[PDB]
Amino acid sequence: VRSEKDSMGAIDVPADKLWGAQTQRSLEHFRISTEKMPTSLIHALALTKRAAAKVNEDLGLLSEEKASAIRQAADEVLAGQHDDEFPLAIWQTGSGTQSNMNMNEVLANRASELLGGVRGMERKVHPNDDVNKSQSSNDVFPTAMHVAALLALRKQLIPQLKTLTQTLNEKSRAFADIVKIGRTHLQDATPLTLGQEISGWVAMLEHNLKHIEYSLPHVAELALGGTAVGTGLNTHPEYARRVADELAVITCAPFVTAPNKFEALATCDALVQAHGALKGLAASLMKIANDVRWLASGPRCGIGEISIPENEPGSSIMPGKVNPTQCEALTMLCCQVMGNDVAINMGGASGNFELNVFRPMVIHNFLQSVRLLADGMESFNKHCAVGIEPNRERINQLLNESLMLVTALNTHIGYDKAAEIAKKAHKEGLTLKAAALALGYLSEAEFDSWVRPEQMV
Amino acid sequence: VRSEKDSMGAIDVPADKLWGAQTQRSLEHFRISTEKMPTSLIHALALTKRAAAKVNEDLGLLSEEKASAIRQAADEVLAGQHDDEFPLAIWQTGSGTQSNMNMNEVLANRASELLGGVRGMERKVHPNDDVNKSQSSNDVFPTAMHVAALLALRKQLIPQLKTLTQTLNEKSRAFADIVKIGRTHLQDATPLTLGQEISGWVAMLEHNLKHIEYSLPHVAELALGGTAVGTGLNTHPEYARRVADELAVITCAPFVTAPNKFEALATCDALVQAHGALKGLAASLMKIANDVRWLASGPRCGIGEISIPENEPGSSIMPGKVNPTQCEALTMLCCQVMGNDVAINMGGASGNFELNVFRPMVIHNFLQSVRLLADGMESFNKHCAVGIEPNRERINQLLNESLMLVTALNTHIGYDKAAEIAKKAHKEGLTLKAAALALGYLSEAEFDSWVRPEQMV
Amino acid sequence: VRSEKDSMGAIDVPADKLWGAQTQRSLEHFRISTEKMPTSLIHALALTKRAAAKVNEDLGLLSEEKASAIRQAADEVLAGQHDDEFPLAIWQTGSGTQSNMNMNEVLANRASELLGGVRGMERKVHPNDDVNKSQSSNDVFPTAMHVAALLALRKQLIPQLKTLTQTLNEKSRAFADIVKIGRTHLQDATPLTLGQEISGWVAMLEHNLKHIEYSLPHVAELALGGTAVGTGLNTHPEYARRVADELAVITCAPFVTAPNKFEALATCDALVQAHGALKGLAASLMKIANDVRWLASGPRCGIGEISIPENEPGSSIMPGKVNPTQCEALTMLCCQVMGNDVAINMGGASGNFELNVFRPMVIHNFLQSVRLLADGMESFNKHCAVGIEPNRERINQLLNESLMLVTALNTHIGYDKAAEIAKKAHKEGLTLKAAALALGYLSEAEFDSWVRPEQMV
Amino acid sequence: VRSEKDSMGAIDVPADKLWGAQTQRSLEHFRISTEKMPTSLIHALALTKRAAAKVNEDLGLLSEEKASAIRQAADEVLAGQHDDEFPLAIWQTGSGTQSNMNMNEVLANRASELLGGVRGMERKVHPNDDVNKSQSSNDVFPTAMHVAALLALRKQLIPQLKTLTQTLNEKSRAFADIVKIGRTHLQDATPLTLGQEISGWVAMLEHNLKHIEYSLPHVAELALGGTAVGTGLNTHPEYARRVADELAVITCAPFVTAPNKFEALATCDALVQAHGALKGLAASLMKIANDVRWLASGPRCGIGEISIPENEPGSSIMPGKVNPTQCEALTMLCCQVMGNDVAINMGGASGNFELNVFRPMVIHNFLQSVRLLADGMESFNKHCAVGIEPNRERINQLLNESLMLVTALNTHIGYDKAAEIAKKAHKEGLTLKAAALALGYLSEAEFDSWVRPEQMV
């Protein structure tokens, strides 16, 4: 152990840990469930502390060595060597006060070691005085939240979306000439090509990308600089703009300071809205994933128009039986995003006065949705999408058995003659040709020259 | 017109209307959307005013004629002749104050006419003084809410549920001997009978009934008697128990006075919980309705194991094409109940101190869900369920084409021989028999005596 | 009555009605609940039939008189004289087939009367043959859905939003100089002006407008032209673009034909996404409405920093008691939009193959949300927002009683002296001045010159 | 490493791990997010494998040593020494096939070591042949799901609920004599005692317990015995009842075999319904937690009627400022449960035919809700509830400042005189007494003897 100290007194802290007293004490008051802060949030919080250090130094508010050590300590968190120094549960103070201190304490104890070498009360860097300089838990957590979200969106989900789109766009191109029977209300309908159907999946993904991109500008607005209530009391007038510019410099993302800090602190609106676009993508992905599994159902008693890769071990006595596992993982996580959206909306609508204190819950759900969506699309693409192949013989079989093509005959034989063979064929269990020949309305050769599915699109 | 008067002054009211000034004034302040109070709520509100009149009279708090006229006026509302006297939107005061007055005013003006004959300021019955005697908008609306819900549950939804159950139970009984191929993950699986599958739908409906019944006792608790904050200030000690007994006498439902009026006024918990059972039934109905439509998909390119009644006009050129319209109405309303549940939960969790003021919205959603569920099951039963018929030839065809029966051979020929024909059959596109015969492992007669689907359940 | 006839036969229809047989028959098969198509959807459906007539005529597909009469009949629906000719419930066929026919039949019977004069089987205009020419229930309903939504958004909700924003922006401007104590976690915090707080409400509304506007382009895409499965079988190549241009000409909205008809028919993605922006606005409105009611709570035992207009009749014995009725209507409808979003998401994710058959439910929820939001903001603005007034004396009282201003003393007397008076004041129940004077650290005059709330923002 | 082997071939597995090939391979196909199976599910899965072993042995289906070693290996999982042997993500095959195998493999390799000693291909116990004997992933996962849920409900959540109830019931008893002003619509209302208000919180918790208990019987029904599709093909007729009895013997819970295995496999109805009761408790907890934070707001500019324990370190310059941290953690997790309910409902309504394949997601949400609820109530009780204390002087102050007591004067001086002092007092900013004395209607002594808040309940 090691006795660390805060305004309430001294408390025992594991010697091999970098956190201080406040983190240790919160660890006892909030022993709820098992959800902790996500790594991406922790790194976004480190990035925030680093940019803040750099700006403070620029404004002569922090000495060269003090600032340089905090930033250097931050890079270690980013390097991933302090993942185990953040034990706090998601279910803490609604402002994310604890996790802010947790970062301040780990960064203070470590920056101290990077200078003199005291981890503990005799440290050279103060968590509150130096690490948390020109800030507040009120404006730091919201900033970390936006940094984590924008970056997760820009380099984790969007790349995977564009990738799924390209694979499906190529599959669409390759199967452009394969005509199949359409289905409306789950009933046989007018034919269309396999590529046309898949092109629908592609159009959907392109539309979604568009909707996700419109929600980025609002998420790119940072609260850092509004301090406690948004007035920005006790901070350099240039601090807000400066910290935003620095964060943008290092992340290469379009971060800007929020034009209205009161809106930035009082709400989680940017994320409520951004998640609206995500549940939209989940509804799209659910339909695409559903189409795939149904299209691949069988091998004998389903639809079986396409085949997908069999990734899980099977049985020799069970040839052709392939459970659509990737489709099941994607549909399941799509339900999660829908649920997460309700949690986010309830927390986002519950702000009071100057601050919204439902933040840890909101970012937990939001980050999880991006993670699920991005990884789900990656897994779906790699283990399923690239392997979509048409069962051409099965597709032809179905096409020739349906009555939906009887429309192509009308231009030669009126509705009367056409509807005649479709009635008998259906009653006797005959195909359009079989029935047409028996009713002597035309020959096989004429049938085969009149019913051209490739011409009815 | 007719100038009616309230504490804010006099206001013009349509001469041919029975409502007073307060209703007229609210009509101008809450012009939001088009949702009004449901007829069932209005009748439950009338029943409440009637029972209150009867108890007041019993406690010598209201004269024989005054009480008798209010009750007689109430019966007219119940008789359905005053449906047009309640113009108020759902989006009013969260306590349902307006609609309470709306009832007080219509019942005062009418009870007046049932005595002397003055509809207006010179009326013989006072809305507040006589009609709203020993009550408050705070405890009257919650009572009307519970009266409307319990009754809608007991004689509108439960009867329809039991009816759907019986139809499906009989269909289950009739198809007990029809063996079909099962489907897990949408892939062909081990066989089961059609009656067994349908018995699953029945077990689900019986379970749901059970869950709906457990939520009734809490909804049967009435708030009437707690007045403004639950203390029951200014009401006869026997009033609460007496009004509950009277309501139970006339509705034949097990109404009782709420043991804790503070919980009764501060929350909508009974309905939040009751609606939990309703969204449960919706998830069950959605699955049953989905099974039906998929099982009936076709006529040629789907599953087509069963046929359902064609209720909508079709085309001669489109024989066998039957859209599962009832399944589409039921699945759509099941989504609505899910949505309604979220609205209900948000309002139910938003109570503050002594009173929950999200009531008009809560009962609007709850009543709509019961209405949708009860009517949906009635329509589904009548126009679909009773008409479920098996396409026996299609079912056999699928059964004999699948490879899932190769298991029945193992008890004669080892896994090695069995898996051999299943591999070839699948590869060459042959049935188990066809492949088995070609591999000379057994004869057609032996195959037909070994693979008995009626014995593998 | 009047015997109308369809492919299933003849059926009795009320003589005084304009609808035909199919509408009459659906009226019996879908007797579910009481929700019917909203007037805005019906008018959007009429606008669609009108533009389709005009384009058909342009392509020599419909004679001058036939086309002119259908359009003229459509304008009557738009003029609002046929509101009672659409009895169909929302809970019908998922494609909205019935309501499409309902429009075809009313427009056929009426256009007939506008020519010769036969309402019924001997009519001069055929619902299917002339009214439903070059269309399908599959592509007509989705078009009507988008027409109704975009127009409701552009001229019903956005105008009300901008209006609420301007009122609040002016209230913000007027109270810019009124300093009040801030509240974080519901605890007293650093001060800010009333105008700054309200400016937060304004920034939120401006952001929302921005988010709603980004969702319009996708909703402006029309499916009309894709026919049954999206291939656009049996329609003039120029039909799609032409009908879109015409609809844009008459509505003055930026309608365009959907680049991908398969996405347009297979999903309700545009509305799932658009509603995402609406639930975002509801979360914002809920917070603003909550701030108002809490800020106006009292008159004696709450916060009471502002007063709002008393629109409902009160009691002389209850002076100052004003229930925040508008805030209760707005918060209630905000919960509804949240619920509606879940219904919309479930239906939007349930599309199968070529068509989504959850449409009537989706547009019912979407249209209701716009209606609730637009009307709610109108009612809130008019009956509450414009009347927001600060209780300046109450605000000063609270400001001078709080300990939050002790920070302003530090620049004269160190933390030691400052924290001393804040400790005693809190313990003894004294103000900062009262305690400061007793501890002889400074004079009243010095206190009154050092603690300037107007300088700590 | 160590080369393990399955039907797809051999694969490299970490030598220091107990899992086999299938687990290793799934680990690569389902790299989605970071959610893994909860410890409680894993232990419920171990309990299932143990009871299955014991029954197999009883039916002479598994040798003494084979059975004894599997059970002994299971107890080690229960002892918590194999927590790190289950790497699988929640986002896997919808039936939970992988995690079932993951358990089979770890239990096979370990039971082998408990006999001869071969961890790997030359092991003495076969995962599929011995560990997964008389079972299927289809009926084993649903059983583990119900075992985990019932036990978490019975010994984790209910105990915490009853504990919170008792604390609040005692606080209610202790403050029974403390009269305070009520609040309806957030406006001052008729008075009630603090104990009466808190008794409302208690009544709510007692009601919830009741609702949670009604959902247990359905969750106590186990699917184990229905095998693949529910027919129970290839299992001892007594197997189902026997395994249920054994599980009940060891867990001491009322487990029984599901009367209908088709309903048990095709749906997650029991959990959809059980979670309905949980979101009900969350709406109740949200209100209680909200009442507390608002009641404790201040120290100067809020309500401040009660004080709560300050558990987080503060500032000397900030005396009396105590953020309601426990209330913020509880309200946040209540939003989560609401969200989780939507995820659960969507998955529960998406079952197809013989099996629901949304199970891993459903149990993940359900288990998390119980965990959050149970731990939240424990933390809230311990760190907040037991410390609720009334600010008696603040409560009196508010009581004497309000106009709500003017009603008590009417029985001496008519409405005219009473409403007179309430009007002036409100206008001049005087209390009822102050105004009453100035208007010479009565003396201070008479006022102090007529306005008795302890008598108006």
mmCIF file of N, CA and C in Angstrom, chain C residues 52-63 133-134 235-243:
data_model
loop_
_atom_site.group_PDB
_atom_site.id
_atom_site.type_symbol
_atom_site.label_atom_id
_atom_site.label_comp_id
_atom_site.label_asym_id
_atom_site.label_seq_id
_atom_site.Cartn_x
_atom_site.Cartn_y
_atom_site.Cartn_z
ATOM 1 N N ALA C 52 -49.607 12.517 -61.116
ATOM 2 C CA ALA C 52 -49.542 11.335 -61.963
ATOM 3 C C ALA C 52 -50.478 11.503 -63.160
ATOM 4 N N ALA C 53 -51.643 12.097 -62.916
ATOM 5 C CA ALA C 53 -52.627 12.329 -63.969
ATOM 6 C C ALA C 53 -52.031 13.264 -65.009
ATOM 7 N N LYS C 54 -51.482 14.376 -64.528
ATOM 8 C CA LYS C 54 -50.863 15.392 -65.366
ATOM 9 C C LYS C 54 -49.722 14.846 -66.229
ATOM 10 N N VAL C 55 -48.900 13.967 -65.667
ATOM 11 C CA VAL C 55 -47.795 13.397 -66.432
ATOM 12 C C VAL C 55 -48.302 12.388 -67.461
ATOM 13 N N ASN C 56 -49.281 11.568 -67.069
ATOM 14 C CA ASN C 56 -49.859 10.576 -67.976
ATOM 15 C C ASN C 56 -50.398 11.294 -69.209
ATOM 16 N N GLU C 57 -51.105 12.397 -68.973
ATOM 17 C CA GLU C 57 -51.668 13.207 -70.045
ATOM 18 C C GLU C 57 -50.550 13.722 -70.953
ATOM 19 N N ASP C 58 -49.456 14.174 -70.345
ATOM 20 C CA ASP C 58 -48.319 14.691 -71.097
ATOM 21 C C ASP C 58 -47.686 13.632 -71.982
ATOM 22 N N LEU C 59 -47.769 12.377 -71.558
ATOM 23 C CA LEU C 59 -47.194 11.277 -72.321
ATOM 24 C C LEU C 59 -48.259 10.606 -73.194
ATOM 25 N N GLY C 60 -49.338 11.337 -73.462
ATOM 26 C CA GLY C 60 -50.426 10.816 -74.273
ATOM 27 C C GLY C 60 -50.970 9.491 -73.770
ATOM 28 N N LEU C 61 -50.860 9.267 -72.467
ATOM 29 C CA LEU C 61 -51.323 8.029 -71.852
ATOM 30 C C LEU C 61 -52.726 8.151 -71.251
ATOM 31 N N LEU C 62 -53.230 9.379 -71.194
ATOM 32 C CA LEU C 62 -54.559 9.644 -70.652
ATOM 33 C C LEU C 62 -55.137 10.849 -71.392
ATOM 34 N N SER C 63 -56.383 10.719 -71.844
ATOM 35 C CA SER C 63 -57.060 11.787 -72.578
ATOM 36 C C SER C 63 -57.213 13.062 -71.749
ATOM 37 N N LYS C 133 -53.207 4.633 -63.098
ATOM 38 C CA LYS C 133 -52.421 4.399 -64.309
ATOM 39 C C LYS C 133 -50.935 4.692 -64.164
ATOM 40 N N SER C 134 -50.119 3.717 -64.579
ATOM 41 C CA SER C 134 -48.648 3.778 -64.531
ATOM 42 C C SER C 134 -48.121 3.759 -63.096
ATOM 43 N N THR C 235 -43.740 1.355 -67.476
ATOM 44 C CA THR C 235 -43.934 2.781 -67.222
ATOM 45 C C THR C 235 -43.023 3.519 -68.177
ATOM 46 N N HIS C 236 -43.449 4.701 -68.603
ATOM 47 C CA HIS C 236 -42.649 5.490 -69.530
ATOM 48 C C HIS C 236 -41.313 5.857 -68.885
ATOM 49 N N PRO C 237 -40.200 5.586 -69.583
ATOM 50 C CA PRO C 237 -38.859 5.888 -69.082
ATOM 51 C C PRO C 237 -38.755 7.266 -68.445
ATOM 52 N N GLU C 238 -39.503 8.224 -68.984
ATOM 53 C CA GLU C 238 -39.503 9.591 -68.475
ATOM 54 C C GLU C 238 -40.503 9.821 -67.341
ATOM 55 N N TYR C 239 -41.372 8.843 -67.101
ATOM 56 C CA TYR C 239 -42.406 8.942 -66.067
ATOM 57 C C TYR C 239 -41.904 9.352 -64.678
ATOM 58 N N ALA C 240 -40.919 8.614 -64.166
ATOM 59 C CA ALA C 240 -40.341 8.863 -62.845
ATOM 60 C C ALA C 240 -39.864 10.296 -62.657
ATOM 61 N N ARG C 241 -38.973 10.748 -63.533
ATOM 62 C CA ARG C 241 -38.452 12.107 -63.462
ATOM 63 C C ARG C 241 -39.559 13.137 -63.651
ATOM 64 N N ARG C 242 -40.484 12.854 -64.567
ATOM 65 C CA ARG C 242 -41.588 13.764 -64.857
ATOM 66 C C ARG C 242 -42.560 13.972 -63.703
ATOM 67 N N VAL C 243 -42.940 12.887 -63.035
ATOM 68 C CA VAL C 243 -43.862 12.983 -61.906
ATOM 69 C C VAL C 243 -43.236 13.754 -60.732
#
